[PDB]
């Protein structure tokens, strides 16, 4: 089984592979199901906006550090500097990362100003009752693009 001037191929089909074939027949299914799942979370979540606020972050390595990219959460430093606590910033749809450390001032001012603008562009309903219906903006990512 070697003949002609053909490129040597490496078609790994010598285990019982036919046993482990995944046809994504449910691709349209699971998109319909994912859309409905979010339309329920939207409605469960009151006017709250489906996602949390994510920070700016410089991507690692010599290949992606040109770009800037949403990180996990806001570091204890940025949260404080932007004038609120970790414990509370979480209940206000702000993601906080106890693991991220601040070594670059530029990014730091960037995220602290990102927290200013977030606070200035939301409203936090009282604990009481009222619940002054105020209609959900759905993302937040979209609202405060990076």
């Amino acid at each position: 089984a070697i003949s002609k001037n053909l490129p040597i191929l490496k078609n790994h089909f010598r285990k019982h592979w036919q046993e482990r074939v995944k046809v994504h027949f449910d691709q349209a299914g699971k998109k319909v199901s994912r859309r409905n799942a979010r339309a329920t979370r939207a409605a469960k979540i009151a006017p709250r906006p489906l996602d949390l606020l994510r920070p700016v972050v410089r991507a690692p390595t010599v290949k992606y550090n040109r770009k800037v990219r949403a990180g996990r959460g806001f570091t204890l430093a940025e949260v404080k500097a932007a004038g609120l606590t970790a414990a509370y910033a979480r209940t206000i749809g702000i993601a906080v990362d106890h693991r991220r450390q601040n070594r670059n001032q530029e990014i730091f001012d960037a995220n602290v100003q990102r927290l200013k603008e977030y606070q200035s562009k939301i409203i936090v309903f009282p604990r009481n009752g009222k619940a002054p219906e105020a209609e959900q903006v759905l993302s937040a990512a979209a609202t405060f693009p990076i």
Binding site: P49, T91, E135, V137
Partner: protein
């Protein structure tokens, strides 16, 4: 004809007990006939009636024993809910809603705030 359930449910515990012996002599006699008569569908109704009295004599002595058990720890297993062998095991809402003293102070102090975006 045939015996009716809501009509039995008014008779005394011992009227019903005698009704059964009335239907039993009744039945026992029909069976002596059924072997002379080519067919005797009468026997079906008299034997369903026995079943109906018995259900009543039993239904009554049961909701007797429920109530004189109702509202306490421990009552015969067969008056406890059936559900599922594993539903029976599941944690009761109480032992499930439990929260630690420390974490209670947390839910109170920083709870999920109802907020919205726009301005």
């Amino acid at each position: 004809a045939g015996v009716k359930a809501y009509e039995l449910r008014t008779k005394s515990k011992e009227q019903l007990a005698s009704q059964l012996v009335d239907l039993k002599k009744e039945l026992a006699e029909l069976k002596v006939q059924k072997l002379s008569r080519p067919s005797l569908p009468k026997i079906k109704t008299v034997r369903k009636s026995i079943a109906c009295v018995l259900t009543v004599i039993n239904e009554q002595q049961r909701e007797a024993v429920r109530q004189l058990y109702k509202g306490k720890k421990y009552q015969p297993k067969d008056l406890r809910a059936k559900k599922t062998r594993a539903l029976r095991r599941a944690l009761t809402k109480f032992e499930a809603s439990q929260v630690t003293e420390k974490q209670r102070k947390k839910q109170i102090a920083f709870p999920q705030r109802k907020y919205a975006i726009k301005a």
